Amino acid sequence: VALPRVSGGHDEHGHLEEFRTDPIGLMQRVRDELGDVGTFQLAGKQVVLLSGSHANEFFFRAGDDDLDQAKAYPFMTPIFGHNAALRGEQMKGHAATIEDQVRRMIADWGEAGEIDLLDFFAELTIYTSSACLIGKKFRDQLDGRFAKLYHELERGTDPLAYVDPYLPIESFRRRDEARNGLVALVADIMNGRIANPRDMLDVLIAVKATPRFSADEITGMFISMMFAGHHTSSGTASWTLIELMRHRDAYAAVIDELDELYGDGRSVSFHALRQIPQLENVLKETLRLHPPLIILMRVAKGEFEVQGHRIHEGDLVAASPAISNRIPEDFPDPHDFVPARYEQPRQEDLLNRWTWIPFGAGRHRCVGAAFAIMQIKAIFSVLLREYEFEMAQPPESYRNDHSKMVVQLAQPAAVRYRRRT
Ligand code: HEM
Ligand SMILES: CSCC[C@H](NC(=O)[C@H]1CC[C@@H](C)CC1)C(=O)Nc1ccncc1
């Protein structure tokens, strides 16, 4: 018995080509035509796309014995080749680290100027991530080259990886070359440390077996440590700023709140760990509209039924924060930016436990969420108190690029700044 299948997908790799150009439109059509359980074809693989509270509950409550997350991502192998840092006791230090990295990034801004949001936030979040997760010593040996290479690595996630992660296409060539470039950067750092003498890199260097670990092995470890939090935090920062500029009433409310809160004289390392309500509600609404992970994958390990539909062993099964986060029965006026949705009387995030899912839900809910929310609070506590921001292009022209499985803000994303006075 065939599962319901969405229209189209008559191209050579079925729906893959559409998934490479407009994955959100594809997923919305699955739901529009078929409901809570529908399928599309990615080359040789059927994807069973689940949506709505009932089907999402099944998806998110499944453990790795039923729905296996790791086997759904074999294409990350050419890229790769956290808990320690996410302990609550370390958060205060991380907030201070992040404040420091932001001030470093804006140190040359002067009175006024123009930035590109992807270039700015992508680079900044390389610095916050490396400093927090590997160490300040290591971060201080990084520069813009590392960020440029890391970005090429992220761009190595074209959905054609579902055909074969090793095809001779330019983005895969560039992925492999970028990884090579990172190993070289890391090798040069290790070499410098020999000649001129602690962090995680020192622990690893000291291991023996003759050194146990090569630059390639170490680079892989560091790439994997930084990956989950990099493009997600970068994009979320960009979109938080874009939504504030698009909604000047929300922006004004956030500024008033930051000024009042910081009037107690306590640092960002204090406040970024505590309530900043208007900014937090803007962040929640930003995540609902612009979830950086638009689809979540699993491989079925068994036979299941969901609303009469049978999932078979080996099936790819997916959930979509992009689609679920806009279900109109759950989120009134789902295309509208309404941070009031999260205020205490409404609490639409908390009420919709299985469909407000920018950070997932149940068994695999984001363990980086507290860090990521603190990081946004720390970044904007600095930026919005020091500078005022305006769009340098039409407000509707800021958009994501969905050509790779790793979503990124499309360029250009030009923004003006001017010192607040
Ligand atoms: C705004 C930033 C972030 C967003 C939007 C986000 C999103 C998500 C989502 C949707 C899931 C569920 C995945 C699934 O069910 O397949 C998840 C899980 C997870 N995230 Fe994040 N993430 C963010 C930042 C981070 C950071 C900074 C880290 C690490 C420092 C991280 C590490 C993880 C890990 C390890 C899981 C798996 C949890 C488990 O399997 O128990 N994420 N995240
Ligand atoms: C489909 S493009 C790759 C997306 C990427 N996924 C990954 O890095 C992981 C690979 C295998 C793991 C078991 C789980 C997911 C990622 O950035 N995931 C992520 C980010 C933030 N939190 C959780 C997962």
Numbering used by the authors: 4 to 84, 101 to 216, 223 to 234, 238 to 449
From the paper:
A potential new target for Chagas' disease chemotherapy is sterol 14α-demethylase (CYP51), a cytochrome P450 heme thiolate-containing enzyme which is involved in biosynthesis of membrane sterols in all biological kingdoms from bacteria to animals. Azoles block CYP51 activity, resulting in decline of the normal complement of endogenous sterols and accumulation of various 14α-methyl sterols with cytostatic or cytoxic consequences. Based upon crystal structures of CYP51 of M. tuberculosis (CYP51Mt), three of the thirteen active site residues, Y76, F83, and H259 (numbering according to CYP51Mt), are invariant throughout the cyp51 gene family. To verify this assumption, we determined the binding modes of second generation compounds containing the N-[4-pyridyl]-formamide moiety by determining their co-crystal structures with CYP51Mt.
Compounds 8 (3-{[(4-methylphenyl)sulfonyl]amino}propylpyridin-4-ylcarbamate), 9 (cis-4-methyl-N-[(1S)-3-(methylsulfanyl)-1-(pyridin-4-ylcarbamoyl)propyl]cyclohexanecarboxamide), and 11 (N-[(1S)-2-methyl-1-(pyridin-4-ylcarbamoyl)propyl]cyclohexanecarboxamide), were observed bound in the CYP51Mt active site as predicted, through the coordination of the heme iron via a lone pair of aromatic nitrogen electrons of the N-[4-pyridyl]-formamide moiety (highlighted in gray in Fig. 2) and interactions with the invariant residues Y76 and H259. Functional groups other than the N-[4-pyridyl]-formamide moiety in compounds 9 and 11 either were accommodated in the species-specific cavity or else protruded through the opening of the active site toward bulk solvent. H259 hydrogen-bonded to the carbonyl oxygen in both compounds, while interactions with Y76 were mediated by two similarly positioned water molecules. The residual Fo-Fc electron density map suggested two alternative conformations for compounds 11 and 9, designated by pink and cyan respectively in Figures 4A and 4B. In both complexes, a portion of the BC-region was disordered and missing from the electron density map. Although racemic mixtures were used for co-crystallization, only one enantiomer of each compound was found in the active site. Compound 9 bound both CYP51Tc and CYP51Tb with the same affinity.
